[PDB]
Design a protein around this nucleic acid. Structure first.
Ligand SMILES: Cc1nnc(C(=O)NC(C)(C)c2nc(C(=O)NCc3ccc(F)cc3)c(O)c(=O)n2C)o1
Ligand SMILES: Cc1nnc(C(=O)NC(C)(C)c2nc(C(=O)NCc3ccc(F)cc3)c(O)c(=O)n2C)o1
Ligand SMILES: [Mg+2]
Ligand SMILES: [Mg+2]
Ligand SMILES: [Mg+2]
Ligand SMILES: [Mg+2]
Ligand SMILES: [Mg+2]
Ligand SMILES: [Mg+2]
Ligand SMILES: [N+]
Ligand SMILES: [N+]
Ligand SMILES: [Zn+2]
Ligand SMILES: [Zn+2]
Lengths: 184, 368, 368, 184
DNA sequence: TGCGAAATTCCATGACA
DNA sequence: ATTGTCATGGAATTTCGCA
DNA sequence: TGCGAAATTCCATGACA
DNA sequence: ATTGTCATGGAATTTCGCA
């Protein structure tokens, strides 16, 4: 069996709805399986159309052999199947109600939801602008299991933005009683 | 003047007037019988005016001016006086072309790492496609890997929108650009400082300095053209295709595609290379580091037989950038403050401002 | 196809497939173990399609196309198939640049006599001066002697007005011009035939062919510029001055002014030459005839290391003259009917019209 | 004494008034003394101004050492004297009522008046257009005294328009009784 | 240990406004 | 305070297959 | 029959849209 | 059925003045 590689498998998923930010409601999340590298795309809907639009950007940089997803409507449509077939991409589905990624990916997907949550409180409407820094953060985060960040695994070099503070990532007591104030 | 010429008439010797010729008076003027014929020897106090009159007929250079004077006059070392005047003619100095070429080009070192240096530039205006007229091209110096963004204008704001998206992937140490309005605005300066990105500018009117990206512009236009043969020029929808196409194209001299240089492994695109299928990613990155350092690098070509290289303190002239019709192609003379490298200099321009300038936009002032 | 590949699998020898390698079956496809790795040997009936797919990714040339194919496949003489396709790609053939230079320039003989050949051309538009925008420049081929006429347009009618005045002095055998609207109109053709004047045209988009007058344009603009430094660009009143100035300026290589070449004696202008003061006019004209024949004439320079010269029947392509943005720079291939001289040819253009054309506006079609 | 040369002396004079042709009334006549070469310029008046305008054209081709003329108002004005002095041209006047040129020039001036007269009858208003051919004629006319035309003496070559017919130059009987009809 | 032919490398040419 | 670049396709050179 | 310096010639460079 | 040209100013070469 051949060793795992970048572009072997992309794990995709939607997060949202979120508070509107510049007319956007959702985030499509792409994580490379081997490197843990993350790409994020703002969409207005979890539709096949928005997925195709966003993946067209990504897949004009690099094309995965396999895309893995749950059985979301946007991912099981025959349009989305056409699109993938055109690009020679094999589609892969986790059985319904049983999401299976990998340890690395699950942990990454967890970091994403939590890092988002942390930064959306205080400024729940300014997230669109923060997506770039969110990604840099995620991608220059040290992996306990491998000695390396996703940046390093993807490109084979150190980054010009090392995130030296392994950050709090937990909700400070101020944000706990004021996150329960925004949802009131 | 009349002192010298007098001593001469009575047959005495003056340095410069050869003794074997006969010098006489006739019609109130001192003459001499030279092999070509009889010429008037004007008094030295008259010679500047003569040279000036001859020169001014058509503002001629050395020989063409001499030949006029020689029709009527002779004196010692005529050309020295001619050259003296040529060197003082404002009009000739700022209108004539140079006849000395630039020194041979530099081949700066390839950036060591992806993201060490971006080169950016605009292409356009292009025929309107979905309301878009320009393309922002961003080319990573080390890899050649290129990013393409359609814009409505070559503006700072559209530059910033695009780069926010690109730098989601990684932040570069340096971004190199030419002197476009978009790149030199203080808004853009701020945007870069905000991210610890250093801005580097080409000398003005020297697109070769952005050669990395300019050259990529060529391929981008060339592929767009081919794809659009016999169709209307709807380029907007092909940008992504072109980007991918080019990033995955081999440079025959290197034997690598920019993709390979950036990632050390092909993604799922046609004809993907498989040579590293049995290496670990770590083994793969190790072979990549080695491939990255051993890439072919060209050397500075031989100088042409009549080039010049700048010297501190030299009088040189900067080309007028957008000269109006029937106006000089050169600015007034100015002085070389610093030789930054053999192809780049700082000059004090007589105003006088410091300007950093390519020698391609300079000539050495003639006659010193 | 499957016939060949079969014989091969059972260990028999086919011309082109070297015998020292092991050829096997795996995953339903014929493979071979080459030094670089294991490659698929597609059936010959598949190869065109493969080459085509590789080429079409970015419309690459020989090596860049080969390198893609080589990632997956091997077969005998791969590049021959690659080149076959490159030679059939309409899009590449009409979009790519040439990489072969033109043959060395011709230095046509100097017209033997004043009035044997005029070269005419327009300069402009210039900044308006007394309602005038253009200058008609007429340059006698033999002497260089030049006439200047201000016009409001580069029109046939204004051309005719001017030449009626010039030809008061003498009628020329031939007038050479480029393909300007003014010179190619049937009204102008009539005007010339009326006077027994033969019209000669440059090939299109090749101002070098009018080099005699183009070069004079340079001096005319250069002197005008100098005279106008620090003043408003009121050139109309300087035309006469400039004309006279230039006609009486020495060419250092020749050692004569155009005036001298035309008349054999200076008129009453500054620094008039006097060497023939003691000859009769007839003695003078005799020395003129001799000066006229012995003038320096340059030779054809050495060819560059990679030039081409046209052969009857060759496939060549004409440059698109005013190509729209993102459109090919070359027309479709066409054939050389006649090699007029080594730098000039007649071609049949596939429409097909006969066109007389400079090789500077041609490339040899690549890959035959 | 040095032999005579082209540009040594220009002989100038006016002819007219003539019937208006394209708004013109006079012809300034310039004849080079040595070659007999002729230039003609149409003017609207025998004024200093019109002379200067016309000679500016000529003297932008070649400049004479001396201009000879009778004592016409246009030639004796101080403006015309300034103009000549500026160009280093010596002015020369025949004493009043006693015009003296040279044999060659007088004969040439005669040819001009007669050739004009001949061509103006029949078309007394179309002369402006004929000035060019008039000059070519005059300048490619064989000189009995010298073996050469003015063209040949000026340029040192044969011309591309030889005027092989030494022409009638006399008024044919049709033109005699119809030249007395135009002046009726 | 050397031949013919194919493969690879060299590099002038030209175009990015 | 900065600096030319590189696809291209014939030709020149090297390597390959065989002996 | 030779030296130093001035004169002349050579010629690459660049510009005519 | 047509085709490059030539001013320019440093450098290279030749000639000049003298002996
Ligand atoms: C200050 C200042 N203001 N303006 C300039 C300036 O440079 N202006 C021009 C019009 C010359 C320009 N040109 C290019 C370019 O691509 N030219 C084509 C080319 C490319 C490569 C090569 F080697 C030769 C030519 C640009 O990209 C560009 O932005 N500009 C502004 O500087
Ligand atoms: C058919 C047909 N339609 N149009 C052409 C055509 O030639 N068009 C252009 C715009 C190129 C042009 N150029 C020049 C010229 O002077 N160019 C500058 C130059 C001079 C010398 C040198 F060596 C290089 C460049 C003209 O005089 C001229 O009349 N034209 C029309 O052919
Ligand atoms: Mg989901
Ligand atoms: Mg630019
Ligand atoms: Mg550019
Ligand atoms: Mg023209
Ligand atoms: Mg022209
Ligand atoms: Mg009179
Ligand atoms: N460098
Ligand atoms: N010729
Ligand atoms: Zn000057
Ligand atoms: Zn193609």
């Amino acid at each position: 069996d051949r060793p795992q590689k970048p572009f072997d498998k992309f794990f995709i998923d939607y997060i949202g709805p979120l508070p509107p930010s510049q007319g956007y409601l959702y985030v499509l999340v792409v994580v490379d399986g081997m490197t843990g590298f993350t790409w994020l795309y703002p969409t207005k809907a979890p539709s096949t159309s928005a997925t195709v639009k966003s993946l067209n950007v990504l897949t004009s940089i690099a094309i995965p052999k396999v895309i893995h997803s749950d059985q979301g409507a946007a991912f099981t449509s025959s349009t989305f199947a056409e699109w993938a077939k055109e690009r020679g991409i094999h589609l892969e589905f986790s059985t319904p109600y049983h999401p299976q990624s990998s340890g690395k990916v699950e942990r990454k997907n967890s970091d994403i939801k939590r890092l988002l949550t942390k930064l959306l409180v205080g400024r729940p409407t300014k997230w669109y602008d923060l997506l770039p820094v969110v990604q840099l953060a995620l991608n220059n985060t040290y992996s306990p299991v491998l000695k390396y960040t996703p940046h390093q695994l993807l490109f084979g070099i150190d980054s010009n933005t090392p995130f030296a503070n392994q950050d709090t990532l937990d909700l400070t007591r101020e944000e706990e009683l004021s996150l329960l104030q925004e949802i009131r | 003047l009349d002192a010298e010429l007098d001593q001469l008439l009575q047959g005495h010797y003056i340095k410069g007037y050869p003794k074997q010729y006969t010098y006489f008076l006739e019609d109130g003027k001192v003459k001499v019988s030279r092999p070509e014929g009889v010429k008037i020897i004007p008094p030295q106090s008259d010679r500047q005016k003569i040279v000036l009159q001859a020169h001014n007929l058509a503002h001629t250079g050395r020989e063409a001016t001499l030949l006029k004077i020689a029709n009527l006059y002779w004196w010692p070392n005529m050309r020295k006086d001619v050259v003296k005047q040529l060197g003082r003619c404002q009009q000739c100095l700022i209108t004539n072309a140079s006849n000395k070429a630039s020194g041979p080009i530099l081949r700066p070192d390839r950036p060591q790492k992806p993201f060490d240096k971006f080169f950016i530039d605009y292409i356009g205006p292009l025929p309107p496609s979905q309301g878009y007229l320009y393309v922002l091209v961003v080319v990573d110096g080390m890899t050649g890997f290129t990013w393409l963004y359609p814009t409505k204008a070559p503006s700072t704001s559209a530059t910033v929108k695009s780069l926010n998206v690109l730098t989601s992937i990684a932040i570069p140490k340096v971004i190199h650009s030419d002197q476009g309005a978009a790149f030199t605005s203080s808004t853009f300066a701020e945007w870069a400082k905000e991210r610890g990105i250093h801005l580097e500018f080409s000398t003005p009117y020297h697109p070769q300095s952005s050669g990395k990206v300019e050259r990529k512009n060529s391929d981008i236009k060339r592929l767009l053209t081919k794809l659009l043969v016999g169709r209307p020029t709807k380029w907007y929808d092909l940008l992504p295709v072109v980007q991918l196409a080019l990033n995955n194209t081999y440079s025959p001299v290197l034997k690598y595609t920019p993709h390979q240089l950036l990632f050390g492994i092909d993604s799922n695109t046609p004809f993907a290379n498989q040579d590293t299928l049995d290496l670990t990613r770590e083994e793969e990155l190790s072979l990549l580091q080695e491939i990255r350092t051993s890439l072919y690098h060209p050397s500075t070509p031989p100088a042409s037989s009549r080039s010049w290289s700048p010297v501190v303190g030299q009088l040189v002239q900067e080309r007028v950038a957008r000269p109006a019709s029937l106006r000089p192609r050169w600015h007034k003379p100015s002085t070389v403050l610093k030789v930054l490298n053999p192809r780049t200099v700082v000059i004090l321009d007589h105003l006088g401002n410091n300007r950093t300038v390519s020698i391609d936009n300079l000539k050495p002032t003639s006659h010193q």
